[PDB]
Structure 1
């Protein structure tokens, strides 16, 4: 029953309970508004601006906004009221002055936060549309800004807004796409439709709930599509005139532009100039209204986008029908990404192995690449949810995938889309912060949108719920912090074992041709097994082990590890390759050489027989023999304690990285420090496995098989100084390579490794923070750098895209 009234209740903040008619900014979407909502709460009379002739008018209540004398007192002047009627200047026309301290009216307990979020606002608009966006450009240059901000995958609207709100990856918050099916529910979820209003889709704790539970009041985040933008601004400004005990501290505004147009005209279509002018106009309204209320040096404002927009046309559609004969057995979630499942789970027929193989490298020009989800690059964090179908298609920028052509012509009207991989430049979006708490005229490096929840909590005095941000990593945006991060404590201390075992105690089936054996180089190799060159091979301290386990630090002339007695292989192996260092080969008599380590018992060692009896599984080394400093030191690289299991297919990638690329990187960057190691993520949750989760061992052994291998490659940002003597900031790139028994992912893998290997490594680029989650290690513990800067460094991603931003 919707028979009450909205008289003096327009946009009430406390949504009331059915049946009783609602007057809040969501009632439209629940068809439950009172009959007089429109009349009272959605006035349009006389438009949204004052003219010289409306000035000092007699308050007429039918007007959408007022230019009457009493209007400041009522809190419902038009945004431009002071300008037109009281000879004031527009906010944009004022010079910008640093806001060193909040300048808040009596009663404001804390600077309010306003989040101005724009759909489809591609990063490069900040430069390319600069001439038509004066307000936005003032915010950007007077406040703090990034050249761009990286969205989450998929680069769709709901996954990204709800990531902004929660600090979580879509796999965790549960909104994993524009549309989705959940099997435990048995239900679907669509942009259109009323199913999406049910609470059970929505995980984590969004900002407005974090605020509420901690005593801070929030304006709504969700606005109804049919409430125009100018009313939404006026509503925020009304709310800001409420009394202290009722007034919210955090507000959001959403724009459907420029996404809406961009889908029609493409990102840079001529029709795109006017949407950008409109957004800007709206921003101007807000800032003018803030200045009327004397809040313009009090409020923190965040101008943030959800995703970008790419050029995409109907004729750049790949059809599953041209790859499969069995197209009726499947369902496709289509578009800029693909997700395939069985059409009927009635069937023990449908087979995912065959589907994938039918979509792998089938046409030279193929504009997509199929994946089981757990083999997606780990940086996408797109797998740990039952709503993510096992089969995924990653689509080339600028293309679509559809099931069949009737699907595209009976179920070209579009020149723009989005949803691609979140490293793609076109998909990048924007960030500006302006206000007392933000820095002044400061550029910051690009960052990921998962990090903002933490900062908005900080801006508000809130303790963040657990999230996927690294709290501290964005402290450099803020003039005044309020959160001071500290390093997690080491949980397991290492053992420093000495020589305890005689070769004859080892029965590992391991042999080496090494018995061609001086007071000079016997003091020498004692210093190298104690830790003399550890100052050049371990540059930033030993990683801390953040869980309970048993492990040994092993020192060597050329490298230091790392060594786990539970997993029987290193957790980490560290080494430095200076610009001048030279590559050698594995001499022939040493090809099959594996040596027992006399610091480590037989029972905590790998054995060579298990590899002999395992026909799928070979082995490799974490510190490469190829980069030995001397023929004598090269014997160190063959220790059984440096060995790890590697599929032959994977050894081709790994040897190329070790033999060619490490040296190339040391050339380009003037020395690199490398840390490499294994990763175990059998349950694809992005988190280090306990031993009882490992699904594969080297046959007949307790030697677990890694899902991935990582490397972190550090040098000096100022590359005129060498890696092992760097005075200031560091530069890093990292990867997490999937440990696969075939190279089906690389369509040119039958060519020389120089044509396909490095391309794979780039696809599987990672943040040091990703590796931390996956290993339970903590890196960069002893540097000269501030911890904040190090957290920034740990969140960096090297993307391999060309010149990007705004």
Structure 2
């Protein structure tokens, strides 16, 4: 029987948070195994795009999950709480690792990884669910522990686990807040309980473990929110998305007026025609990307006008979705297990490179991807 892979995502865990004395279990895991200095997200530095990049090895411009919120001429609208969009395979390009696993006759079990609610390339994981808010830490940990222990025809080569708590605390209170640190500690402790349970089950010694995040988190101090209609008024363009990556579609005949309003450098953002976006972001060819794309500067939000109004203007908040090269946006990568190196540190690298490692650890042929297989070869035990 080949070694299983446990893939854990801690949404919004910034790379530097491993070095603050608040992650005893993950710090121990990293010392036993391999730790990268940091892992850069792909553009845009948002949840759905990056989780899907992690499991496909494709940049969002290629896999088609180009934002958390999208429009498509054929498929219509997509956003995180539109279940029949999220569950519709036609949105999701490439081949995520769970599809690769199932196609070899092996099985995958997912606790709410973006894309796992669809039948991508026709293939669902063996275990999966519709993601719902407020599930207990023990509920998901005990499920994952179960899925790793299963034998016979329900044995799982791949098991995935996801935590939202650090991201949620970061948005509500900022990454330097006691709330963000408390969430980090809680998730770390839950992971400690999973590891101890795997050891009692005898699954620990035959399971490779990868812990990642999708992106980091930056502070958004009071007064750092504008309206998307400050960028372009609604009669000349429609804001398709708000937040930090702001897509605009000019109204009919209004392309020139929209460009006059939007293009170039502004106080706390910059905008480009999608074909002219900075080359380093490798983004803007996909048809689902709006004609005009604005990038908010680090620490600023641009909101739909009704949100800006209900934004309770008091305290410090957090956001991501900023330039992926920023230190604040850096994510985590660590790995440990029977097939992985021991007491190793790796340079910072791009998240597209994780897929090649996982495909090797899962015994699946690597689908074509945007990563470099060389990058994480040093993570292997030999």
TM-score in same-fold range (> 0.5): yes
Equivalent in the alignment of 1:385: 286
Deviations 1:584-636 (A, max 9, x none): xxxxxxxxxxxxxxxxxxxxxxxxxxxxxxxxxxxxxxxxxxxxxxxxxxxxx
Superposition deviation, residue 165 in structure 1:
1.0
SS in 1 for 2:341: coil
Equivalent in the alignment of 2:81: 192
Distance 2:141 2:79 in 1: 28
Equivalent in the alignment of 1:183: 73
Equivalent in the alignment of 1:123: 15
Superposition deviation, residue 477 in structure 1:
1.2
Equivalent residue in structure 2 for 1:434, among 336, 341, 363: 336
The verdict on how the C-alpha distance between 1:300 and 1:377 changes in structure 2, with shifts beyond 3 A counting, is same
Superposition deviation, residue 358 in structure 1:
2.3
SS in 2 for 1:471: coil
Equivalent residue in structure 2 for 1:205, among 95, 105, 123: 95
Equivalent in the alignment of 1:235: 143
Equivalent in the alignment of 1:270: 178
Superposition deviation, residue 362 in structure 1:
7.0
Distance 1:376 1:430 in 2: 26
| 2:266 matches 1:359 | no
8 Å contact 2:68–2:79 — kept in the other structure?
Answer: yes
Distance 2:359 2:197 in 1: 25
The verdict on how the C-alpha distance between 1:160 and 1:323 changes in structure 2, with shifts beyond 3 A counting, is closer
The verdict on how the C-alpha distance between 1:221 and 1:204 changes in structure 2, with shifts beyond 3 A counting, is farther
Distance 1:328 1:175 in 2: 28
Equivalent residue in structure 2 for 1:296, among 200, 204, 207: 204
Equivalent in the alignment of 1:412: 312
Equivalent in the alignment of 1:750: none
Equivalent in the alignment of 1:375: 276
Equivalent in the alignment of 1:330: 237
Deviations 1:422-451 (A, max 9, x none): 111111110100111111100010111111
**Higher strand fraction: Structure 1 or Structure 2?**
2
SS in 2 for 1:450: helix
Deviations 1:49-72 (A, max 9, x none): xxxxxxxxxxxxxxxxxxxxxxxx
8 Å contact 1:158–1:177 — kept in the other structure?
Answer: yes
Which runs of no fewer than 5 residues in structure 1 stay unpaired? 1-108, 481-806
Equivalent residue in structure 1 for 2:374, among 448, 453, 472: 472
Distance 1:246 1:322 in 2: 54
| 2:26 matches 1:136 | yes
Equivalent in the alignment of 2:54: 164
The verdict on how the C-alpha distance between 1:264 and 1:402 changes in structure 2, with shifts beyond 3 A counting, is closer
SS in 2 for 1:113: strand
The verdict on how the C-alpha distance between 1:322 and 1:211 changes in structure 2, with shifts beyond 3 A counting, is closer
| 2:298 matches 1:397 | yes
8 Å contact 2:56–2:97 — kept in the other structure?
Answer: yes
Distance 1:165 1:450 in 2: 9
| 2:4 matches 1:112 | yes
Distance 2:337 2:207 in 1: 6
SS in 2 for 1:331: strand
Distance 2:222 2:259 in 1: 24
Deviations 1:271-295 (A, max 9, x none): 2222112111111111101110123
8 Å contact 2:111–2:140 — kept in the other structure?
Answer: no
SS in 2 for 1:453: helix
Equivalent in the alignment of 2:116: none
Q: How many residues align?
A: 360
Superposition deviation, residue 244 in structure 1:
3.2
8 Å contact 1:144–1:432 — kept in the other structure?
Answer: yes
The verdict on how the C-alpha distance between 1:309 and 1:229 changes in structure 2, with shifts beyond 3 A counting, is same
Equivalent in the alignment of 1:612: none
Distance 2:301 2:381 in 1: 44
Superposition deviation, residue 339 in structure 1:
0.6
Aligned Cα root-mean-square deviation (Å): 1.9
Superposition deviation, residue 400 in structure 1:
1.6
SS in 2 for 1:116: strand
8 Å contact 2:107–2:155 — kept in the other structure?
Answer: yes
Distance 1:451 1:475 in 2: 10
Distance 2:138 2:297 in 1: 38
Superposition deviation, residue 411 in structure 1:
8.5
Distance 2:7 2:307 in 1: 38
8 Å contact 1:183–1:386 — kept in the other structure?
Answer: no
Distance 2:109 2:238 in 1: 40
Distance 2:51 2:257 in 1: 36
Consecutive aligned runs of 4 or more in structure 1 exceeding 6 Å deviation: none
8 Å contact 2:356–2:373 — kept in the other structure?
Answer: yes
The verdict on how the C-alpha distance between 1:340 and 1:237 changes in structure 2, with shifts beyond 3 A counting, is same
Superposition deviation, residue 239 in structure 1:
2.3
Distance 1:237 1:374 in 2: 46
State TM-score, norm by structure 1. 0.43
SS in 1 for 2:284: coil
